[PDB]
Design a protein around this ligand. Sequence first.
Ligand code: HEA
Ligand code: FES
Ligand code: FES
Ligand SMILES: [Cu+2]
Ligand SMILES: [Cu+2]
Ligand SMILES: [Mg+2]
Lengths: 50, 153, 49, 99, 285, 21, 159, 52, 56, 188, 50, 243
Amino acid sequence: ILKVARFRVLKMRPKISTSYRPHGKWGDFLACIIPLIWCINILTNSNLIL
Amino acid sequence: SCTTRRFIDEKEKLEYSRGYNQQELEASKLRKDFVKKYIVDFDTTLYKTQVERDWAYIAKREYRYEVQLKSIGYGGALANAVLLWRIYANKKMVFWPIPIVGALGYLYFQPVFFQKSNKRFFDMCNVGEEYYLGRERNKILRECNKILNVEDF
Amino acid sequence: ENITALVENCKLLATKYEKPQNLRQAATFMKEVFKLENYRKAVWNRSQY
Amino acid sequence: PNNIKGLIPKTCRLPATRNWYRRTSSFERNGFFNIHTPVLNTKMIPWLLFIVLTWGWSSFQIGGYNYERFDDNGERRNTLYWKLSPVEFPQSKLWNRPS
Amino acid sequence: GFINMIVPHNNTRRVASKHHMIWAIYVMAYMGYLVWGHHMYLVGLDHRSRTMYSTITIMISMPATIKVVNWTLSLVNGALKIDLPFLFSMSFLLLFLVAGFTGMWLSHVSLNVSMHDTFYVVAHFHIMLSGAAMTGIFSGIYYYFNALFGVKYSRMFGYMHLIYYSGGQWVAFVPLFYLGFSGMPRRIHDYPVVFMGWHSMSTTGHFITLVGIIFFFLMMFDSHIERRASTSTTLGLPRWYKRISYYIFKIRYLQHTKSKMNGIPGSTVRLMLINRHFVEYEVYE
Amino acid sequence: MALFFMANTAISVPSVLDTSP
Amino acid sequence: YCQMDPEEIMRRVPGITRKEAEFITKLGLSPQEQVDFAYIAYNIGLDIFYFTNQMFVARQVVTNSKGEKVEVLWNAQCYEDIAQLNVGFAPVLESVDYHWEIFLWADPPIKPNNDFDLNVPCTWFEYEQEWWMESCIQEDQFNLPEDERPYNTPRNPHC
Amino acid sequence: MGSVWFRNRYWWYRSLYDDYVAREAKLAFGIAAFIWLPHYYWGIHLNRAFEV
Amino acid sequence: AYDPELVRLEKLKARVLLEEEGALLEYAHFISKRPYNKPYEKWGVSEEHVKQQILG
Amino acid sequence: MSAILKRAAKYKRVSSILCEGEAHLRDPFTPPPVILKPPAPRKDKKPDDITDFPAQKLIPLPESIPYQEGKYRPASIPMVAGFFPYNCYLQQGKVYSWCSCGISQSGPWCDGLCNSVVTRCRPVVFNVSQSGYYKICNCKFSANAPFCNNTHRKMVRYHHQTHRGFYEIWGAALFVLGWVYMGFNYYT
Amino acid sequence: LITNSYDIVHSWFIPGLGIKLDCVPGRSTHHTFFIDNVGFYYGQCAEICG
Amino acid sequence: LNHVQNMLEENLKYDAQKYNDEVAVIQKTSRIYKPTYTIEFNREGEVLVYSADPIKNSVVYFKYPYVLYEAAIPLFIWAWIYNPLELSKNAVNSLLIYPNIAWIPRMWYWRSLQYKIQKMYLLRGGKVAKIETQSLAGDRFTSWVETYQFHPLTQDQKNFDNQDNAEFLEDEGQLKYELGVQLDNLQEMGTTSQDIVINFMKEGTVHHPELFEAIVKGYNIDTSDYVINTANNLRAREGNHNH
Ligand code: HEA
Ligand code: FES
Ligand code: FES
Ligand SMILES: [Cu+2]
Ligand SMILES: [Cu+2]
Ligand SMILES: [Mg+2]
């Protein structure tokens, strides 16, 4: 939030984005670890309680 | 419980404000000696009985928090004040005052704290005659009761 | 109204004299501003208003 | 009053180093009244820390510490023995938390 | 999709992962056909069926995290041009943040058994639907106000609507979630007096939301009374994919700013006037 | 839960000592 | 107001028209950007006097392999939202016209497909495809000064 | 941890998202540890109460 | 970068230890002016000094 | 001005070679430096006139450069992309293009992506007369052309010397130490 | 507890025990209950009974 | 609202009209200096005047004003934790205010460190000067400013020094003191800010000192005798000893 609100505005360090196409391959699986951890924790807690 | 702990702490503060007497002072000295020897400087893991070890560890944690930690905090506050004054004088950050005044304050407030919760720590030693620590605590309590002409528990 | 009068007198004084350089200078400037008979007349008129 | 002892006469504009408060809004020479300035960003950095970071990780804990210190976790006084009584735990559902 | 379309034009940057987001939406749609038993966990189905339903419900959050990450990443490292649409998109993202957490917490079997068909579920449903969906609808309305209406939006009343509407949703959903944590049953005609505070807070939030709706209607009326042509902030170049394009955009922006800032008093004159504003003195020379 | 979910194991909590006469 | 000396720009870009620099110096960009724009105009033959409007965003003159002096009107585009695209027939910036029929003549838009065989390497300023990410990485990197870089080490025995 | 573990960070960068927030990540990690201390202390106290 | 007055006192003490001509006299005279709270002469040019002059 | 003229009698000039040196000294492709005296001012400034200053020689960007014998300096500051050299097994006599862009997605070999980004560095074509597992530079700042001059360590030290780099490294270490402290206080 | 409904789908929702037995007609729901805390807890029909 | 009359308002309106009519953007210049040496501008048509690394010459971690509050925060933390004064919950919460504000002075000092002109160059024509600095986060920011925008300040910096006849440098060219100079409007990152004071440190090197004094004096320089240095010795964002 701070970086976008201080160095991303037009009057403060704008950037010329030359991005014709995205080329991500493992981003979703890499970021999915956080949801996986929450799911595992919830499942463990439920199985313990149930 | 939490209410019991609050009541104990407040009563200890009120008693320390009221006075320390002479027979009470001698009893406090004896209790401090007992706590330092058998609890504070004695590793709780060395006790024979596991239950005795658990009770001694609880008492040791209480001493570490209520006496050691509180005295360290008071000494740190005094050291911060002294270091602030010194840095104001020299207009620069010194290094000796922090440790020196911290050690001095720990030494000073170490007894005062031990002066306040002297009875309370003793209250954590009543394991019972089934433990050697319990027998020694019972003997010490009997000596203190003989000194003070009052029946403690 | 009293605040507005004091602020206007302070603005006039700043247009007349340089800004205070220290705490003692600020105290002296405040005393000088408060001493203004213009400030007193402004206090009276602003009290009526 | 022309002569004022203790007040040096004003002779010219002083450099900005004599100002007692750094203003935020600035004037763009095209006539604009710009609020978003580097000084504005610098001033906005502090307060955002108090709301986004500080309170979001200290408000609930501070409140619990104050309550347990002063209210004893809201316990009823007429109980028999702590050995055989239900323990009234302190605050556990974080008020600052959305859930 | 509305939020994703709104964000790309405002930041003049490419989306984070378009193919990944499309595939995630399709996978979420495919997965939604297997969460039937999730809403009927307390009906007492076979334990195998309950376990399968719970496992499918927990795994559904995998696509949503991808979408949130893609939105957050696309919002960064771009040329932000703040419009009224951008604030609504941010509000929609913020509302969607809490709803996902509430749904994931409700996915726990024990928590669901402790809160099935209650004010917690009511809050989850409302914040997921009344907040996120209506906020996105309003955002798309503001994002395409010109083409639909033919006139530029009213800045002040639009800001008032975006302020009052965003606040009302949280004001009415926080007390509901609090009562859900207290276990207030859903669809109840009356409650014990212990729920009065939270109920009153929720009612006040609903009234604030109604006031915000009235403000949006007044915004529509003001936009109709304004009758001023709107100009695309992108100026025909929504992406500065080239240095020449960026330079041309900068030159045109400077020219349009100079033309727009015409007739406004100069900086020096405005400063002089502002300094000489106070003209009420008691005695003169 | 998890391997480290509560992040704190209160091993100091001892069994309540019975004090019947 | 950081206008540079046109001769310097003329020195920076051999082949640029002096008046153009005077037009360039009146643009209002910092001298580095002004020099870059002048170089770009000199290389691509861009007409720097044409106003950027709704019909044609820019005008350019070129000489094809047939030798004809042709003109290319670089028109405005949209971010995949034709409804958001201001369809106009005037040299203005405002969106005033609202044609009820998107395709009055019922001709749908045609998105031409460039076959793989009939394709040429990117030559429209391909030297900046990854410039954004590269500059982000460079700004995110602190470089060891050349005064500290070791020099004249032993050559590789098999090199 | 971060770009160090990979041999071609650029590739790695793209291979996630083609976006860069590295400085934000580093400052955030530092502040996160510095803030995570207190909730840990409070949770320790609460867990002790629960065990009691 | 911290204490110019202390640097000067150190120079005087070094001269005294090396047993210069003045030595004791100069070291005593500079010591005769040893105030309790020395001023922080190293005031920053970019640092704001008006509102921060009290602590000096 | 006039008083300044007086001060001109004693004012001295200093060269600006600082922290960069003479690039022509290190890069063989970089021509030796020259000092060009501007021509006399033109009498009539016409709109259609062109500049008359002497033209600098045209040095086109080479597609690839030969492997300088340990005396290769970066043309433009390349991407860091790694703090550990890569031990790659190269067959003898096979011309391999060591990447210099730093954005090459095809490992140590050049990926041709250099021709798509704004930088002066081009890949270096090298040939090893003896096959084997040689340590190819990954710091992209090794004085030795294909070989890692262990200057990765120097770059890491310089980064650790920087305030922001020190802050980042210390924050990562602090998070690891926080995890360690949580583990240490776990059983309590 | 053999939960069942005589007329329509009702619910015994003891918030204190955190339990909610969905009494449906014909469905003899055999559910386990363990009162791990001595106490009096309140509850109501967690279904719209009419 | 115009029905009421004030002669002060009338005078102000007349003065505003006079300023709008007479004071124009195009203004004649008189302070002109012809240098005593032919200047060899760099490949980018620039001549360096002052080079400095104030960050390398600054005490960053242990500063004078910030250290006091930064250390005193623990005292308030301890007072709040231990409740030594036995106050109320509200009073303790109030006592907690001090630690949340201690960052302001250190932040202000760090921001102030960014305003120092690390590098200064004069472009061809002698009208615009490029000043480059580096924010302590390592953010290299450069800006071109007009020649007329500079005004010197005294060595004590308590009063604006005379725009002419100032002696802020040694005879050989080295700066006589760490100098402060006010700029009426500086376009930092494209955003114009008003009345900003920059500082040139004594540790800097005054290359070609005479022109620097002309830059200090603010007079426009006659760039007649100019040579071109053909040496691309500067790299894109080349690493600098200031970091
Ligand atoms: C459009 C509306 C909408 C949406 C999007 C959702 C999305 C989800 N819903 Fe539900 N739901 C309803 C509308 C919706 N829901 C309605 C109306 C009911 C009630 C029907 C009735 O009345 O009975 C209901 C009921 C309902 C129940 C049972 C309530 C009851 O018993 O009836 C459950 C529990 O499993 C559930 C789960 C979920 C989950 C797990 C998601 C997931 O898709 C969302 C979870 C996704 C995330 C978690 C990603 C968020 C990303 C993050 C990274 C969050 C982490 C952030 C922080 C912790 C800061 N929903
Ligand atoms: S230098 Fe990297 S692709 Fe050629
Ligand atoms: S990787 Fe070691 S010096 Fe290049
Ligand atoms: Cu019912
Ligand atoms: Cu019912
Ligand atoms: Mg239900």
